[PDB]
Design a protein around this ligand. Structure first.
Ligand SMILES: C[C@H]1COCCN1c1cc(NC(=O)Cn2cc(-c3cc(Cl)c(O)c(C(N)=O)c3)c3c(=O)n(C)cnc32)c(Cl)cn1
Ligand SMILES: C[C@H]1COCCN1c1cc(NC(=O)Cn2cc(-c3cc(Cl)c(O)c(C(N)=O)c3)c3c(=O)n(C)cnc32)c(Cl)cn1
Lengths: 122, 122
């Protein structure tokens, strides 16, 4: 019976992306081959089965650096990190295979399914 | 021209609330009179002008305990902390004045405006 604010979740994510853009309270650096990406672990956990499984473990929760599998494409990861913070996915014919593979690795099922839909329409 | 996921922002907030419920990566305790509330600073910053102004300051950014003004009602704060993590506001005749006052203090303008609308309809 509570009052529903339709734009609050979107507004919160926009503010989290703004915080990431200014490196404010970022607590992890994700290393993908020769590239690095700072992020908030909470957002990563909220968006990825891989990161959720990592940081819910007390063994790994305080890690400040995570090195991804060497085969992961940095642009593919960048596209998915942007998606986590914006709800928008930059899928193109030139990046679909890399994004889909990276989404599988990050355990983002709805993204992978969407990639399968993009392939089906192309 | 990116693909839009209409439910991702909502889903992310739900996962952040789930993380708060298990005290996973909470980094601040908010003390309100005789009560304490653990939260994520990033979410607080994303939702409150007060908390944004606090944690964007390097002087205060690493504070693990924030004591609110003694006049703040703990239930009023609890209602607003729940709103930050769910987009749902539990406004009732028995709590409107306390919630509105607390929202003013936390600098949550759209909430305050909504409280003014609740008063106007009551
Ligand atoms: C365990 C659940 C259920 O019971 C209550 C607790 N609860 C929970 C889960 C949390 N994190 C994740 O689920 C991590 N996680 C996020 C996505 C995810 C999320 C969003 Cl929002 C998306 O948009 C997309 C997408 N478009 O692919 C994907 C995702 C996933 O897909 N797979 C296959 C596996 N793990 C995933 C947390 Cl942090 C707290 N509680
Ligand atoms: C400075 C802005 C603009 O330029 C780019 C950077 N940018 C920004 C702002 C951030 N945080 C806040 O705005 C903190 N903040 C959140 C709300 C807020 C947010 C949501 Cl989502 C709500 O639903 C409601 C509500 N219902 O009352 C209120 C709010 C507010 O109301 N007032 C009056 C003052 N400060 C507020 C961050 Cl973290 C990063 N960047």
């Amino acid at each position: 019976s509570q009052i529903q604010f339709t734009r609050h979740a979107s507004d919160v994510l926009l503010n989290l992306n703004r915080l990431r853009s200014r490196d404010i309270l970022t607590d992890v650096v994700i290393v993908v081959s020769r590239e690095q990406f700072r992020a908030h672990k909470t957002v990563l956990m909220a968006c990825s089965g891989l990161f959720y499984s990592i940081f819910t473990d007390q063994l790994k929760r305080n890690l400040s650096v995570i090195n991804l599998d060497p085969e992961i494409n940095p642009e593919g990861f960048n596209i998915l990190l942007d998606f986590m913070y914006t709800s928008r996915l930059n899928l193109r014919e030139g990046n679909i295979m890399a994004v889909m593979a990276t989404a599988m690795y990050l355990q983002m099922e709805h993204v992978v399914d969407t990639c399968r839909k993009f392939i089906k329409a192309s």
